[PDB]
Amino acid sequence: MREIVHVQGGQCGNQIGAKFWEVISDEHGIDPTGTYCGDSDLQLERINVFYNEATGGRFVPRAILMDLEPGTMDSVRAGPFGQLFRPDNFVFGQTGAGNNWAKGHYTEGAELIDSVLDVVRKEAEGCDCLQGFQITHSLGGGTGSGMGTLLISKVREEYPDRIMETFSVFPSPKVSDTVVEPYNATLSVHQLVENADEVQVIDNEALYDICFRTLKLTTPTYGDLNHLVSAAMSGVTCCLRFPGQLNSDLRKLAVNLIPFPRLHFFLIGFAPLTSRGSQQYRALSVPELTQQMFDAKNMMCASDPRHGRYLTASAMFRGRMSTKEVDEQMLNVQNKNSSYFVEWIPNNMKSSVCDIPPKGLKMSVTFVGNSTAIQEMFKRVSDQFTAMFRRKAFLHWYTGEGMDEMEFTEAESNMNDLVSEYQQYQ
Amino acid sequence: TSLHMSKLVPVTDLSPRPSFRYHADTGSLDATLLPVDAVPQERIGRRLI
Numbered sequence: 247m248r249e250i251v252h253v254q255g256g257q258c259g260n261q262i263g264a265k266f267w268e269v270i271s272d273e274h275g276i277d278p279t280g281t282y283c284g285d286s287d288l289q290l291e292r293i294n295v296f297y298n299e300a301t302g303g304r305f306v307p308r309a310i311l312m313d314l315e316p317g318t319m320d321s322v323r324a325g326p327f328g329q330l331f332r333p334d335n336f337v338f339g340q341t342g343a344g345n346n347w348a349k350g351h352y353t354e355g356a357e358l359i360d361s362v363l364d365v366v367r368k369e370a371e372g373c374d375c376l377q378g379f380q381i382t383h384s385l386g387g388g389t390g391s392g393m394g395t396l397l398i399s400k401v402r403e404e405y406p407d408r409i410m411e412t413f414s415v416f417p418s419p420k421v422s423d424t425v426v427e428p429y430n431a432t433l434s435v436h437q438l439v440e441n442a443d444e445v446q447v448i449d450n451e452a453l454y455d456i457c458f459r460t461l462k463l464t465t466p467t468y469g470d471l472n473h474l475v476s477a478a479m480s481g482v483t484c485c486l487r488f489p490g491q492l493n494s495d496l497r498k499l500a501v502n503l504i505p506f507p508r509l510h511f512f513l514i515g516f517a518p519l520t521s522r523g524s525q526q527y528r529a530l531s532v533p534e535l536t537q538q539m540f541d542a543k544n545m546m547c548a549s550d551p552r553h554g555r556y557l558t559a560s561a562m563f564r565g566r567m568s569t570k571e572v573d574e575q576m577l578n579v580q581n582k583n584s585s586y587f588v589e590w591i592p593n594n595m596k597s598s599v600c601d602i603p604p605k606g607l608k609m610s611v612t613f614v615g616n617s618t619a620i621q622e623m624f625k626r627v628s629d630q631f632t633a634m635f636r637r638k639a640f641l642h643w644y645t646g647e648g649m650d651e652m653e654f655t656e657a658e659s660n661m662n663d664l665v666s667e668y669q670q671y672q
Numbered sequence: 673t674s675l676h677m678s679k680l681v682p683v684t685d686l687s688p689r690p691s692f693r694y695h696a697d698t699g700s701l702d703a704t705l706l707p708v709d710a711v712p713q714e715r716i717g718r719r720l721i
């Protein structure tokens with residue numbers, strides 16, 4: 247019935263589409279050549295949520311590749327699980343947005359958008375119905391942040407009532423790649439705030455923090471960081487394909503985590519993540535899942551939630567597991583950490599149960615938490631935005647192809663008042 | 673006679689003469705099911721390190 251349409255833009259998007267669809271193929275038993283193995287009913291009884299039967303018995307992804315340079319699509323095609331994707335869903339740009347938001351958006355975001363939205367329309371309307379879109383990209387890049395946001399604008403205008411899920415990785419304050427760093431962040435934010443339903447915040451230095459401090463890796467590559475995000479976004483959507491005792495889809499998450507439609511920014515995490523040093527030494531119990539999860543060393547955002555206040559929460563569990571230890575732990579957090587939760591909403595979190603746990607783990611949990619700790623992220627992006635916008639630095643790359651000064655002034659104007667309205671619920 | 677003994681068909685074989693050298697039949701790269709009729713092609717990509 248319902249299908250989630252994955253769109254992935256930028257070279258972070260094309261890599262995250264290869265790694266998210268190989269953990270989906272891992273649950274579903276999808277052979278890399280396209281077939282199925284595993285001999286179980288529960289995978290294929292909802293296979294239409296992600297996969298389309300292609301009259302050969304093979305299951306193709308509902309994934310929309312997106313980039314402005316063909317090198318990063320050659321790498322994901324040559325890699326394992328790369329022959330799953332339909333080549334027509336690949337769109338090829340030739341010039342490329344070189345870390346530049348403006349030329350990513352307007353004048354090399356226009357000649358490709360008329361063909362990639364032709365792909366999206368061909369794929370979505372071919373299905374009988376929709377459940378929503380899920381666009382994963384980067385907001386520090388050129389093409390994933392420039393025209394990845396412009397697709398978000400046009401499919402929202404065309405299809406307004408469908409959900410707008412978007413996993414977006416942000417600038418890292420500590421490690422500074424893409425040296426024109428806050429311009430790409432801020433220009434994408436003041437569009438995405440009023441023109442999305444659910445934004446999930448990923449930050450690469452938080453993912454480095456969970457590799458080093460809880461997973462005990464020595465050399466974490468980009469493959470491990472990509473694999474960690476794929477844990478979370480598979481667990482957010484685990485009930486769309488597997489049954490449960492208390493069922494929740496993406497619209498379930500939107501209606502509960504959002505008190506006011508303007509604020510929809512969340513911290514995301516997955517449990518459990520430990521090394522082989524402590525793999526055998528720990529009980530996989532429901533209190534152990536939630537005590538490890540409610541801390542700063544498991545969030546995928548570089549904002550400490552102890553500095554703010556959890557406005558709304560949602561713990562979405564997985565596996566064969568008792569329902570009393572769900573709600574008793576989700577109320578013990580309120581009775582213990584009462585000051586870390588807002589007072590004018592009682593029972594701030596939502597439970598959900600997916601009966602099928604992930605591969606090799608008997609029980610897991612994902613978490614979507616709307617807090618005011620997102621605000622300290624936006625001050626730490628803005629104080630570098632205005633530090634180099636006052637002194638007119640690097641703006642000849644931004645005014646020579648279509649913008650003016652007013653669009654830049656509206657950029658911090660539309661996110662500093664996001665900061666101010668995060669203050670009023672603190 | 674150059675015709676047959678009983679009924680009128682020529683008997684002396686035939687004398688053919690082609691016009692040109694007759695090459696380039698334009699072997700089409702599409703079959704009756706029209707995929708492309710693929711042969712191993714070239715990658716136009718970066719070195720796959």
Ligand SMILES: Nc1nc2c(ncn2[C@@H]2O[C@H](COP(=O)(O)OP(=O)(O)O)[C@@H](O)[C@H]2O)c(=O)[nH]1
Binds near residue numbers: 255261468469
């Ligand atoms: N989470 C994640 N971030 C990445 C990955 N690769 C690159 N990045 C980040 O994305 C930034 C580079 O942006 P990029 O995607 O190359 O620009 P674009 O191709 O024009 O969209 C760097 O600062 C990296 O920190 C990845 O595989 N995963």
